[PDB]
Structure formats: structure tokens, C-alpha cells
Design an enzyme around this catalytic site. Structure first.
Site, PDB file in Angstrom:
ATOM      1  N   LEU A  71      64.728  20.606  14.330  1.00  0.00           N
ATOM      2  CA  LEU A  71      63.444  21.298  14.295  1.00  0.00           C
ATOM      3  C   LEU A  71      63.423  22.530  15.191  1.00  0.00           C
ATOM      4  O   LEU A  71      62.624  23.447  14.966  1.00  0.00           O
ATOM      5  CB  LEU A  71      62.325  20.344  14.707  1.00  0.00           C
ATOM      6  CG  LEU A  71      62.058  19.191  13.731  1.00  0.00           C
ATOM      7  CD1 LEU A  71      61.039  18.235  14.334  1.00  0.00           C
ATOM      8  CD2 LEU A  71      61.608  19.736  12.364  1.00  0.00           C
ATOM      9  N   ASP A 108      55.169  29.364  29.702  1.00  0.00           N
ATOM     10  CA  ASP A 108      55.906  29.655  28.476  1.00  0.00           C
ATOM     11  C   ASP A 108      54.980  29.623  27.263  1.00  0.00           C
ATOM     12  O   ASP A 108      55.392  29.206  26.175  1.00  0.00           O
ATOM     13  CB  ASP A 108      57.054  28.639  28.314  1.00  0.00           C
ATOM     14  CG  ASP A 108      58.013  28.999  27.192  1.00  0.00           C
ATOM     15  OD1 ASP A 108      58.038  30.193  26.781  1.00  0.00           O
ATOM     16  OD2 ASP A 108      58.742  28.075  26.719  1.00  0.00           O
TER      17      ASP A 108
HETATM   18  C1  LIG Z   1      57.188  24.011  18.361  1.00  0.00           C
HETATM   19  C2  LIG Z   1      57.703  22.747  19.029  1.00  0.00           C
HETATM   20  C3  LIG Z   1      57.955  23.018  20.496  1.00  0.00           C
HETATM   21  C4  LIG Z   1      59.174  23.896  20.671  1.00  0.00           C
HETATM   22  N1  LIG Z   1      60.293  23.352  19.935  1.00  0.00           N
HETATM   23  C5  LIG Z   1      61.524  23.202  20.484  1.00  0.00           C
HETATM   24  O1  LIG Z   1      62.497  22.942  19.794  1.00  0.00           O
HETATM   25  C6  LIG Z   1      61.557  23.361  21.982  1.00  0.00           C
HETATM   26  C7  LIG Z   1      62.837  22.876  22.510  1.00  0.00           C
HETATM   27  N2  LIG Z   1      63.870  22.477  22.866  1.00  0.00           N
HETATM   28  C8  LIG Z   1      60.160  22.954  18.561  1.00  0.00           C
HETATM   29  C9  LIG Z   1      58.928  22.118  18.347  1.00  0.00           C
HETATM   30  N3  LIG Z   1      58.672  22.062  16.914  1.00  0.00           N
HETATM   31  C10 LIG Z   1      59.179  23.117  15.813  1.00  0.00           C
HETATM   32  C11 LIG Z   1      58.109  20.869  16.408  1.00  0.00           C
HETATM   33  N4  LIG Z   1      58.019  20.775  15.075  1.00  0.00           N
HETATM   34  C12 LIG Z   1      57.467  19.695  14.526  1.00  0.00           C
HETATM   35  N5  LIG Z   1      56.954  18.627  15.130  1.00  0.00           N
HETATM   36  C13 LIG Z   1      57.068  18.744  16.447  1.00  0.00           C
HETATM   37  N6  LIG Z   1      56.630  17.808  17.333  1.00  0.00           N
HETATM   38  C14 LIG Z   1      56.888  18.237  18.608  1.00  0.00           C
HETATM   39  C15 LIG Z   1      57.493  19.469  18.529  1.00  0.00           C
HETATM   40  C16 LIG Z   1      57.612  19.805  17.149  1.00  0.00           C
END
Ligand SMILES: C[C@@H]1CCN(C(=O)CC#N)C[C@@H]1N(C)c1ncnc2[nH]ccc12
Length: 288
Positions: free
Chosen positions: A16, A136
Site C-alpha cells: 500500500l 508530517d
Molecule cells: C496513507 C497511509 C499512511 C501512509 N502510508 C504509508 O505507507 C506510510 C509508511 N510507511 C500508506 C497508508 N495508506 C496508503 C493506507 N492505505 C489504506 N489503508 C490504510 N490504512 C492505514 C494506512 C493505509
């Protein structure tokens, strides 16, 4: 707090993201081996990391352990990873992903953007109430759960403010989201998160268009002829009073609030507490 997820039931699906020295991954947690199992987002400390990274990681886990709010990603539990010799951080999976990945592909109206802004401030007030700074705050760390709901989804740079202090003293720094005092005095106030919110708000009103992003805009003003002096040069342009421009069809009064979050003088900025009433009133205004 609270639950322990056993890695024997965790099935990796999808990466992700990747943030500081961590990766966030999508797993299916399937005890009954059925496909009935729950999807979860799992953050881990990267494939190699030293003592600074690791002491931070323990701090991040503890902070996310104690936060609980409508607009903060839900902490679900931990997972022994033996592995890396540390825990993995398990959270709810929000499938629409970040505003940064989302907004460039979906024409969202003004009223919804302001609603997200209101919601980001709510989460940030709560977070300040509990004595933390985020450090951040940017659209890539705001998750769209649906429609009428955003959550702050990452705490990798977050820090407790020493109980007898107004600031925390600080590379990987997202300098194009930072106030002058952070770039110069290396101090990080609560007001310093408000500056970042102003840039995040600018990000929203530009639908996170890559050509209009802060690094792009600020590096156009700074130029790349002397990379050695990027921070120095950014600090001088800011202290000169130059700011990120008005996004297309941004209401005049919203850019006003944006600029007020960008006061050079920190104490002249609104708190997140101040913004909540202002934003929800401006939100209301723009539906009807
Ligand atoms: C935007 C969210 C926070 C930052 N992200 C990181 O990969 C940081 C690091 N290492 C991805 C996360 N994201 C795309 C997610 N996408 C979907 N479900 C999520 N649950 C919690 C985070 C999350």
C-alpha cells in the site's frame, strides 16, 4: 492496548505504501482459512534499520496505541515479527487510499474539500490536546474512508512535546511543508503543524496535481542551480513573504485562511481549535 494478531493467519495481498523506514502492506487476516477474514493495513520497520530508526519505531507504536478519534486511523493491534525483531503495527484498511492518490483521479467539489479540511483540523486538535506534534501533515498521510470522511493515517514523525516546553527540537524532512522556524531554528511548535495544514489545504484545492505541488512550485522559485542551498533559499523566500499561489477557483476567503496559517510569525497563526468553527461555517456556506 489490545489485540494480538498471529502472523500465521496473515495473508499478504498488496503493498500500500512506503513512508520513513517502514512499509505499509495490505493483508487478509484469516483464522478460519475462509476468505471471510478481515482486511488490515500493516506497518512494519523496513528490511534493515539501526538504533535511531528502532527507538523511533517504539515511540510510534506507543503513540498510535494511545490515540483514539473519529479522524485518526483506527489502531487494531500488533503482530510479533521475529523477523525484524520488532512488532508490526496493524490498523484498519481504508481502500480508497490517500487523498494524494485519490484526488488527481476524482473531480471532487469545493464543499467536500472543506469538509475534509474541517475533519483534518479536528484530528489535529485532538492530537495537540494529547500533546503530540505530527511533523508530517500532508495529503499523502490523509486517508479517504468515504466520501464524507477522512482520517489522518500516519504518525511516523510524530513526537510528544516535553511537558515543560512549547516546542520539540529536531535528512528525510518534508521541508516544503515546513514553517521558517523549523527550517531555521530547528524547533517544532504546535503552530508548525498549522503551517503544514495550510500546505495540505493548498494540496486539496489543487486536487494534488503533481505540476502544482509545493516541491514543484517552490523549486521553480528557488531553482535547482544550487542544490546545496535549497533549504537556505526556501527560508529566505518565505521570510520575504512569498507564498504558494492561489489555486484555481479557490474562494478568496479560503486563501485568506490559508495565508493566515502561513504567518511567518508563529504566534500569529490560528490553532487547530480556532480553525474548527471557521471551517465548518465555511463548509456549511458552500453546499447551499
Ligand atoms: C496513507 C497511509 C499512511 C501512509 N502510508 C504509508 O505507507 C506510510 C509508511 N510507511 C500508506 C497508508 N495508506 C496508503 C493506507 N492505505 C489504506 N489503508 C490504510 N490504512 C492505514 C494506512 C493505509
Amino acid at each position: 492496548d489490545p489485540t494480538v494478531f498471529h502472523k500465521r493467519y496473515l495473508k499478504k495481498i498488496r503493498d500500500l505504501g512506503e513512508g520513513h523506514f517502514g512499509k505499509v502492506s495490505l493483508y487478509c487476516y484469516d483464522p478460519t482459512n475462509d476468505g471471510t477474514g478481515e482486511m488490515v493495513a500493516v506497518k512494519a520497520l523496513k528490511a534493515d534499520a539501526g538504533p535511531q530508526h528502532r527507538s523511533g519505531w517504539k515511540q510510534e507504536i506507543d503513540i498510535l496505541r494511545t490515540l483514539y478519534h473519529e479522524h485518526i486511523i483506527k489502531y487494531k493491534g500488533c503482530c510479533e515479527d521475529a523477523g525484524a525483531a520488532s512488532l508490526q503495527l496493524v490498523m484498519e484498511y481504508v481502500p480508497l487510499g490517500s487523498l494524494r492518490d485519490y484526488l488527481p483521479r476524482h473531480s471532487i467539489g469545493l464543499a467536500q474539500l472543506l469538509l475534509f479540511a474541517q475533519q483534518i483540523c479536528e484530528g489535529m486538535a485532538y492530537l495537540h490536546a494529547q500533546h503530540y506534534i505530527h511533523r508530517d501533515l500532508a495529503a499523502r498521510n490523509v486517508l479517504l474512508d468515504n466520501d464524507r470522511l477522512v482520517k489522518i493515517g500516519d504518525f511516523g514523525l510524530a513526537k510528544a512535546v516535553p511537558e515543560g516546553h512549547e516546542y520539540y527540537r529536531v535528512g528525510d524532512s518534508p521541508v516544503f511543508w515546513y514553517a521558517p522556524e523549523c527550517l531555521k531554528e530547528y524547533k517544532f511548535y504546535y503552530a508548525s503543524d498549522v503551517w503544514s495544514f495550510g500546505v495540505t489545504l493548498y494540496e486539496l484545492l489543487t486536487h494534488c496535481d503533481s505540476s502544482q505541488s509545493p516541491p514543484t512550485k517552490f523549486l521553480e522559485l528557488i531553482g535547482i542551480a544550487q542544490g546545496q542551498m535549497t533549504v537556505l533559499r526556501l527560508t529566505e523566500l518565505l521570510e520575504r513573504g512569498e507564498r504558494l499561489p492561489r489555486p484555481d477557483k479557490c474562494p478568496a476567503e479560503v486563501y485568506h485562511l490559508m495565508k493566515n496559517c502561513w504567518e511567518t510569525e508563529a504566534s500569529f497563526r490560528p490553532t487547530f481549535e480556532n480553525l474548527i468553527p471557521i471551517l465548518k461555517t465555511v463548509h456549511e456556506k458552500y453546499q447551499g
